[PDB]
Amino acid sequence: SYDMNVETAAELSAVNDILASIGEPPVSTLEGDANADAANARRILNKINRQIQSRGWTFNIEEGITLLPDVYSNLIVYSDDYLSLMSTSGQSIYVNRGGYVYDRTSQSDRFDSGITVNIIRLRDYDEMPECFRYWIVTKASRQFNNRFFGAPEVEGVLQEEEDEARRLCMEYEMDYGGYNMLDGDAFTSGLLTR
Amino acid sequence: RSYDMNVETAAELSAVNDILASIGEPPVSTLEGDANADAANARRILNKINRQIQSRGWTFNIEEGITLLPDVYSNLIVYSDDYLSLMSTSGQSIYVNRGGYVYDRTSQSDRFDSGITVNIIRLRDYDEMPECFRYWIVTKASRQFNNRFFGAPEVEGVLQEEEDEARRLCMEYEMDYGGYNMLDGDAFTSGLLTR
Amino acid sequence: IKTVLTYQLDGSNRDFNIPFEYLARKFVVVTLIGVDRKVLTINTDYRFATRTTISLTKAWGPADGYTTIELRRVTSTTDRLVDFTDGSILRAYDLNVAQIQTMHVAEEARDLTTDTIGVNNDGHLDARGRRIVN
Amino acid sequence: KTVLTYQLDGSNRDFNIPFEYLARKFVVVTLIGVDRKVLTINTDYRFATRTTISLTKAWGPADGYTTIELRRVTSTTDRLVDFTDGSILRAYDLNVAQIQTMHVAEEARDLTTDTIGVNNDGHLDARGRRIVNLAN
Amino acid sequence: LNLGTGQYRFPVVGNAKFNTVYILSDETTPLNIIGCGWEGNYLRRSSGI
């Protein structure tokens, strides 16, 4: 798992908002000063950053990208940044065995010339649409409000906010993906040929 | 501090932190040593649930056609505790374990010459799992460790919902990943559509 | 002294003892060299009977085509056993485990000599079988 | 530079050591010879300054023992630092804790150059030796 | 002289255990402090006794 050893000003305003969620004052830097609450907040932000990217979204899913095996090894590293390797068409055949891509079906960890896989890869919190950047915070604003300051009334308002945030996020790609029923897919695009 | 640092962490250790974050206590630095109880309990509940989430068969887990092979001298094939399921490839599985060895229930023979072919669910580690499940193995362990030790009802009632959301996402993961087809990809009604 | 040791495989011996001071356990790997490298899994085939023995379940031998059980300890560079975290007591057990693990990695780095080409009597470089490739 | 041979002709006691070491017990001195011999410390070699060892007698090419080859064997089990509960930490403590591992690694990476090894050009140089037992 | 009577409500935010408040005055004018209050969310999970 990639771990948090670097800092960012746009990311710093997120941890401030997770400390707002309890009722705590904003930190000014994430130096390492013994602020247990800030440390825990950074943990929950990262730990939830790796869900929102994991649920596949259209800009997240790189499609058709080719992973290249190292030439002498003949295997490809399947690192912890690759949230979902999948495959392009159906019955994805690649699985992580050890740390390397393994063809589940052909029982081989050795590849020559690469694979076309659809990979969802970790992107930084900053590299995220603003719609999700709110929702990664306000989802972390729930679990951080459930694990350390377990007051029920400030949670039950927050859960009604996490959901609104999710709606706004979902609205974001249904515009952004631009998905067409009868003119843009694989099956019923072919049926409409005259 | 340099932005240019890519450094990694224990995906196993970071899972035990997430358990201890959940019940509510500071992050424990190192899992090593059988002194800390919380680590041992949080690590065991992680392991004891890892063998369940995997046991339910998922498409990646289920290796198909894996040929187990008999010992040349005693002709008996071992059934380990890492074999979460061993089942026949087609139907009416005939293999069961007697005394720790694969036994053919139908022919009543513990002795196999030349091998058997089966669908094994192999037990693999938290780090070989899809992220979708690696979240759900933790947040299911985050419930039973909240259940068995920190029995406050209000945060298990919060955490339950999370385990359920995780199940939904985990399920979505293979219905994409397996890519299963009604009328073009199965055994029966793929054969009916031949013109 | 010494991280990588190999045993000899006869059909009926299944217990082999591990000299090195392994941290963890996932760190010992047991690969049946034989004719073809074959790695043994943690519980299906081999099992740690005592801290110091690895007892195979199948009791492999040459009849299966495998000789020379090679059980070497590979410390993991990425999967660190200690991750210091802000706000946590700096316990001395943590610093010592960190130092022990990195020194174990270096100790196994000292064994690559047992790994490489090899020098025969004289300066002759040697390749016992092992056709050079690339 | 964990290894360097000091071929000296007479009874020359002084042999400077450039590998900074952590302790006396790490530097082991052998005379390259028809037979290699590990000279013991108190009896045979004494550290005049930390930098320079000074042998007693020093043998010689005339003697069977020839050249002297000193080297660093930094122990991987006897840890120089043992962190304990305070026991004030000492800056000298952490830095040495990491220097021992850096030393073990650095002197272990020279146990490869003694074999084929790599020249600056990027090519694996056999030192004019003959590769035996190879297959096509 | 500006001398006044009242309640000054000021925001102290955070865990009680780690927050410190001090009143410091080096001015020529007088000072009176009658009482001090505080409010705040309290949530003990383990319902004690």
Side-chain angles (χ1 to χ4, degrees), chain C residues 43-60:
Chain C
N43 263 337
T44 69
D45 33 2
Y46 91 88
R47 35 165 246 97
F48 273 79
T50 323
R51 284 204 72 259
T52 196
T53 48
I54 40 126
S55 305
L56 309 191
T57 45
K58 196 191 161 292
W60 293 79

mmCIF file of all heavy atoms in Angstrom, chain C residues 43-60:
data_model
loop_
_atom_site.group_PDB
_atom_site.id
_atom_site.type_symbol
_atom_site.label_atom_id
_atom_site.label_comp_id
_atom_site.label_asym_id
_atom_site.label_seq_id
_atom_site.Cartn_x
_atom_site.Cartn_y
_atom_site.Cartn_z
ATOM 1 N N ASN C 43 1.265 -24.162 3.775
ATOM 2 C CA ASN C 43 0.613 -25.203 4.552
ATOM 3 C C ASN C 43 0.151 -26.402 3.752
ATOM 4 O O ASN C 43 -0.074 -27.456 4.347
ATOM 5 C CB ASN C 43 -0.593 -24.628 5.302
ATOM 6 C CG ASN C 43 -0.257 -24.266 6.718
ATOM 7 O OD1 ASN C 43 0.698 -24.788 7.289
ATOM 8 N ND2 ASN C 43 -1.037 -23.362 7.301
ATOM 9 N N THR C 44 -0.020 -26.281 2.437
ATOM 10 C CA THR C 44 -0.538 -27.404 1.672
ATOM 11 C C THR C 44 0.484 -28.521 1.588
ATOM 12 O O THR C 44 0.126 -29.704 1.619
ATOM 13 C CB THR C 44 -0.928 -26.955 0.269
ATOM 14 O OG1 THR C 44 0.255 -26.623 -0.465
ATOM 15 C CG2 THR C 44 -1.817 -25.730 0.332
ATOM 16 N N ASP C 45 1.764 -28.170 1.478
ATOM 17 C CA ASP C 45 2.809 -29.157 1.249
ATOM 18 C C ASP C 45 3.858 -29.199 2.348
ATOM 19 O O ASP C 45 4.194 -30.288 2.817
ATOM 20 C CB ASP C 45 3.456 -28.901 -0.113
ATOM 21 C CG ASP C 45 3.477 -27.446 -0.464
ATOM 22 O OD1 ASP C 45 3.020 -26.644 0.371
ATOM 23 O OD2 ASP C 45 3.906 -27.112 -1.584
ATOM 24 N N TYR C 46 4.385 -28.061 2.777
ATOM 25 C CA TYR C 46 5.337 -28.024 3.878
ATOM 26 C C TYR C 46 4.728 -27.254 5.035
ATOM 27 O O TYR C 46 3.932 -26.342 4.819
ATOM 28 C CB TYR C 46 6.668 -27.395 3.459
ATOM 29 C CG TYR C 46 6.789 -25.903 3.666
ATOM 30 C CD1 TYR C 46 7.242 -25.387 4.864
ATOM 31 C CD2 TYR C 46 6.491 -25.021 2.653
ATOM 32 C CE1 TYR C 46 7.359 -24.034 5.050
ATOM 33 C CE2 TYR C 46 6.609 -23.670 2.824
ATOM 34 C CZ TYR C 46 7.045 -23.182 4.025
ATOM 35 O OH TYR C 46 7.171 -21.826 4.205
ATOM 36 N N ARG C 47 5.109 -27.619 6.255
ATOM 37 C CA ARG C 47 4.566 -26.987 7.455
ATOM 38 C C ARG C 47 5.565 -26.855 8.566
ATOM 39 O O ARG C 47 6.217 -27.808 8.917
ATOM 40 C CB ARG C 47 3.414 -27.805 7.994
ATOM 41 C CG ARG C 47 3.555 -29.304 7.839
ATOM 42 C CD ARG C 47 2.558 -30.053 8.701
ATOM 43 N NE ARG C 47 3.219 -30.810 9.758
ATOM 44 C CZ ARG C 47 3.359 -30.386 11.008
ATOM 45 N NH1 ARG C 47 2.876 -29.212 11.377
ATOM 46 N NH2 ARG C 47 3.981 -31.149 11.895
ATOM 47 N N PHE C 48 5.645 -25.698 9.208
ATOM 48 C CA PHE C 48 6.674 -25.451 10.227
ATOM 49 C C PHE C 48 6.452 -26.171 11.515
ATOM 50 O O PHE C 48 5.846 -25.631 12.420
ATOM 51 C CB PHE C 48 6.748 -23.972 10.565
ATOM 52 C CG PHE C 48 7.645 -23.180 9.691
ATOM 53 C CD1 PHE C 48 7.236 -22.778 8.444
ATOM 54 C CD2 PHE C 48 8.877 -22.786 10.146
ATOM 55 C CE1 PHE C 48 8.060 -22.023 7.645
ATOM 56 C CE2 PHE C 48 9.703 -22.031 9.359
ATOM 57 C CZ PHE C 48 9.298 -21.649 8.104
ATOM 58 N N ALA C 49 6.983 -27.359 11.652
ATOM 59 C CA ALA C 49 6.705 -28.137 12.836
ATOM 60 C C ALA C 49 7.182 -27.543 14.122
ATOM 61 O O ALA C 49 6.476 -27.588 15.117
ATOM 62 C CB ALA C 49 7.280 -29.510 12.682
ATOM 63 N N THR C 50 8.374 -26.992 14.131
ATOM 64 C CA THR C 50 8.932 -26.382 15.321
ATOM 65 C C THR C 50 9.378 -25.099 14.727
ATOM 66 O O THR C 50 9.300 -24.937 13.522
ATOM 67 C CB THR C 50 10.170 -27.119 15.804
ATOM 68 O OG1 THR C 50 10.003 -28.523 15.596
ATOM 69 C CG2 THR C 50 10.426 -26.851 17.273
ATOM 70 N N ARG C 51 9.834 -24.160 15.519
ATOM 71 C CA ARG C 51 10.381 -22.961 14.938
ATOM 72 C C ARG C 51 11.527 -23.352 14.048
ATOM 73 O O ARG C 51 11.771 -22.728 13.050
ATOM 74 C CB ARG C 51 10.882 -22.021 16.021
ATOM 75 C CG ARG C 51 9.780 -21.277 16.742
ATOM 76 C CD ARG C 51 10.294 -19.993 17.365
ATOM 77 N NE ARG C 51 10.587 -18.959 16.377
ATOM 78 C CZ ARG C 51 11.806 -18.663 15.934
ATOM 79 N NH1 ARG C 51 12.860 -19.321 16.398
ATOM 80 N NH2 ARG C 51 11.968 -17.703 15.034
ATOM 81 N N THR C 52 12.257 -24.380 14.418
ATOM 82 C CA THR C 52 13.418 -24.765 13.669
ATOM 83 C C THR C 52 13.347 -25.950 12.684
ATOM 84 O O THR C 52 14.380 -26.411 12.245
ATOM 85 C CB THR C 52 14.600 -24.918 14.621
ATOM 86 O OG1 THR C 52 15.827 -24.922 13.885
ATOM 87 C CG2 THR C 52 14.466 -26.198 15.443
ATOM 88 N N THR C 53 12.173 -26.448 12.321
ATOM 89 C CA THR C 53 12.104 -27.497 11.302
ATOM 90 C C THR C 53 10.986 -27.248 10.308
ATOM 91 O O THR C 53 9.975 -26.689 10.690
ATOM 92 C CB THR C 53 11.820 -28.845 11.926
ATOM 93 O OG1 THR C 53 10.727 -28.718 12.837
ATOM 94 C CG2 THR C 53 13.030 -29.369 12.673
ATOM 95 N N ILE C 54 11.131 -27.671 9.051
ATOM 96 C CA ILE C 54 10.083 -27.481 8.093
ATOM 97 C C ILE C 54 9.771 -28.872 7.676
ATOM 98 O O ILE C 54 10.603 -29.550 7.126
ATOM 99 C CB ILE C 54 10.513 -26.614 6.914
ATOM 100 C CG1 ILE C 54 11.933 -26.928 6.472
ATOM 101 C CG2 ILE C 54 10.467 -25.152 7.294
ATOM 102 C CD1 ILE C 54 12.037 -27.268 5.003
ATOM 103 N N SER C 55 8.592 -29.356 7.995
ATOM 104 C CA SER C 55 8.279 -30.733 7.716
ATOM 105 C C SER C 55 7.362 -30.893 6.551
ATOM 106 O O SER C 55 6.212 -30.541 6.627
ATOM 107 C CB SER C 55 7.585 -31.312 8.909
ATOM 108 O OG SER C 55 8.367 -31.136 10.068
ATOM 109 N N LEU C 56 7.838 -31.518 5.494
ATOM 110 C CA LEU C 56 7.042 -31.692 4.327
ATOM 111 C C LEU C 56 5.935 -32.664 4.631
ATOM 112 O O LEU C 56 6.131 -33.554 5.427
ATOM 113 C CB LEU C 56 7.907 -32.263 3.252
ATOM 114 C CG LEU C 56 9.241 -31.644 2.883
ATOM 115 C CD1 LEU C 56 9.669 -32.332 1.605
ATOM 116 C CD2 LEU C 56 9.089 -30.152 2.655
ATOM 117 N N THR C 57 4.760 -32.496 4.044
ATOM 118 C CA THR C 57 3.631 -33.403 4.211
ATOM 119 C C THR C 57 3.739 -34.601 3.279
ATOM 120 O O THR C 57 3.392 -35.725 3.659
ATOM 121 C CB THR C 57 2.323 -32.668 3.970
ATOM 122 O OG1 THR C 57 2.452 -31.868 2.791
ATOM 123 C CG2 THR C 57 2.010 -31.763 5.139
ATOM 124 N N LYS C 58 4.219 -34.385 2.060
ATOM 125 C CA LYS C 58 4.260 -35.429 1.051
ATOM 126 C C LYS C 58 5.525 -36.268 1.108
ATOM 127 O O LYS C 58 5.542 -37.365 0.542
ATOM 128 C CB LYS C 58 4.118 -34.817 -0.345
ATOM 129 C CG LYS C 58 3.762 -35.814 -1.423
ATOM 130 C CD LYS C 58 3.891 -35.207 -2.799
ATOM 131 C CE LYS C 58 3.998 -36.277 -3.865
ATOM 132 N NZ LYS C 58 5.278 -37.023 -3.764
ATOM 133 N N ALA C 59 6.569 -35.792 1.780
ATOM 134 C CA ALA C 59 7.848 -36.492 1.829
ATOM 135 C C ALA C 59 8.378 -36.753 0.421
ATOM 136 O O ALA C 59 8.473 -37.892 -0.034
ATOM 137 C CB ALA C 59 7.743 -37.789 2.627
ATOM 138 N N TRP C 60 8.694 -35.670 -0.279
ATOM 139 C CA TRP C 60 9.166 -35.764 -1.655
ATOM 140 C C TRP C 60 10.463 -36.549 -1.737
ATOM 141 O O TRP C 60 11.139 -36.780 -0.731
ATOM 142 C CB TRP C 60 9.381 -34.369 -2.230
ATOM 143 C CG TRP C 60 8.132 -33.618 -2.395
ATOM 144 C CD1 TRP C 60 7.439 -32.972 -1.431
ATOM 145 C CD2 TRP C 60 7.411 -33.429 -3.609
ATOM 146 N NE1 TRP C 60 6.321 -32.392 -1.963
ATOM 147 C CE2 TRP C 60 6.282 -32.661 -3.304
ATOM 148 C CE3 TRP C 60 7.609 -33.842 -4.924
ATOM 149 C CZ2 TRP C 60 5.353 -32.293 -4.264
ATOM 150 C CZ3 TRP C 60 6.692 -33.479 -5.872
ATOM 151 C CH2 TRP C 60 5.576 -32.710 -5.543
#
